[PDB]
């Protein structure tokens, strides 16, 4: 039925498709579109995960031997002209330079965007990069967006006397005749307060081989992280409603960009994963905490990692994102931070990147190679900041391949981009970030003070 909606479209129109019925919104809708449009025509489907693109590819070449199917999760294909439907990852087209990306994308009758709501750096790069020639393409963006009892589990006050201590959540002792699953933010608590249940008397386990031995005996009470990737006869769910995910702080004073792991609330979909862990077998329970699960995923960190894919081509990934989201209306905007990340994206690409630094990004194991690109405007040698452990300065450092870095000492560098832990060392060692020495970063700073005021 939605086929004649999709087949109304000219080159230069976009549609958002909400419906996600059956085991394949991304399987059945393009099938129906290529039935109507013809097997002589190439159709593109873009899937976040590499494995999901392969899984859907295997299933569709099996259910449908009349229609041709193609997989693109690896290396580039030059002059690629496969005539059927193509299941590809976003990372695949993220290899492509802008002439090649254009040359690839105009060759399709339709381009289907699957699970745009994940907002991975490869996703935000692609969707922003294709909107640059939005006039030449037909773009369709689709998404997904037994009894369970609701109680907001109340927070435990310090020094307080039919309840048990579960990381500051009030859950009754009577619910320890069942089988319960604890969701926690810190990668540390799932070792510690999971040990505590065993130190209280409750049979417990953390986050494969250790899981199989733990799962068999009862009562079982497990503390776990975000691993949907079901469960042996799960009775009850407890949720702290929080997670540990990356944030980006922007300031007009050095360091301009600060990033790191932070305790933030989950989304509605990410909560539905926690709400939907029990129930299917028998009517189970749900105990969340007193924080609102957000409507959208806060993507601003991934948007920063996304800027890396615009450097070689000279594309402002953040500018390209802003305009795409004005036309297509895919995501929620924090106007101020988006506006702030843009001026930094003007700094990032204001100059040609030095050939040496352009090598280091490609071959290193640094989790944030973008940090090297931002700091190259002020620093010619990367700086090893002493690692922070349990909020305190250590003697340990990060050994990252190809960095050729200088250890901090007391010499504090002029950094445009820093980490919370790097910023904390400078607080705690009793030290100060110096002022900008390069005028282009001065210019960016003046601009960021201006855009916060309004």
Automatic annotation (TrEMBL):
Domain Helicase ATP-binding: 6-153
Location of the protein in the cell: Host cytoplasm; Host endoplasmic reticulum membrane; Host nucleus; Virion membrane
Domain Helicase C-terminal, residue spans: 168-325
Function statement: Plays a role in the regulation of viral RNA replication.
Oligomer status and interactors: Interacts with host IFIH1/MDA5; this interaction is involved in the inhibition of IFN-beta production. Homodimer; disulfide-linked. Heterodimer with E1; disulfide-linked.
Family classification: Belongs to the pestivirus polyprotein family.
Protein name: Genome polyprotein
């Amino acid at each position: 039925e939605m086929v004649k909606k999709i087949t109304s479209m000219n080159r230069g129109d976009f549609k958002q498709i909400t419906l996600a019925t059956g085991a394949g919104k991304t399987t059945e809708l393009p099938k129906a579109v290529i039935e109507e449009i013809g097997r002589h025509k190439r159709v593109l489907v873009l899937i976040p995960l590499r494995a999901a693109a392969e899984s859907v590819y295997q299933y569709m070449r099996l259910k449908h031997p009349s229609i041709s199917f193609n997989l693109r999760i690896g290396d580039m294909k030059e002059g690629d002209m496969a005539t059927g439907i193509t299941y590809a990852s976003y990372g695949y087209f993220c290899q492509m330079p802008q002439p090649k990306l254009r040359a690839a994308m105009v060759e399709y009758s339709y381009i289907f965007l699957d699970e745009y709501h994940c907002a991975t750096p490869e996703q935000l790069a692609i969707i922003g990069k294709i909107h640059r020639f939005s006039e030449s393409i037909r773009v369709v963006a689709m998404t997904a967006t037994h009894p369970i009892e609701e109680f907001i589990a109340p927070e435990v006050m310090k020094g307080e006397d039919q309840f048990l201590d579960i990381a500051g959540l009030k859950i009754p002792v009577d619910e320890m005749k069942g089988n319960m699953l604890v969701f926690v933010p810190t990668r540390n608590m799932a070792v510690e307060v999971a040990k505590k249940l065993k130190a209280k008397g409750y049979n417990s386990g953390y986050y494969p081989a250790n899981l199989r031995v733990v799962t068999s005996q009862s009562p079982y009470v497990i503390v776990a992280t975000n691993a949907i990737e079901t469960l042996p006869d799960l009775d009850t769910v407890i949720d702290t409603g929080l997670k540990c995910e990356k944030r980006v702080r922007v300031s007009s004073k050095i360091p301009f960009i600060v990033t790191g792991l932070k305790r933030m609330a989950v989304t509605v979909g990410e909560q539905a994963q926690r709400r939907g862990r029990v129930g299917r077998v028998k009517p189970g329970r749900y105990y969340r905490s007193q924080e609102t699960a957000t409507g959208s995923k806060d993507y601003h960190y991934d948007l920063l990692q996304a800027q890396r894919y615009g450097i070689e081509d000279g594309i402002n990934v953040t500018k390209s994102f802003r305009e795409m989201n004005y036309d297509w209306s895919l995501y929620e905007e924090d106007s101020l931070l988006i506006t702030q990340l843009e001026i930094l994206n003007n700094l990032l690409i204001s100059e040609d990147l030095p050939a040496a630094v352009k090598n280091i990004m490609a071959r290193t194991d640094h989790p944030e190679p973008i940090q090297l690109a931002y700091n190259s405007y002020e620093v010619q040698v990367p700086v090893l900041f002493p690692k922070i452990r349990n909020g305190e300065v250590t003697d340990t450092y990060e050994n990252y391949s190809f960095l050729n870095a200088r250890k901090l000492g007391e010499d504090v560098p002029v950094y445009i981009y820093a980490t919370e832990d790097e910023d904390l060392a400078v607080d705690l060692l009793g030290l100060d970030w110096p002022d900008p020495g390069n005028q282009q970063v001065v210019e960016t700073g003046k601009a960021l003070k201006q855009v916060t005021g309004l």
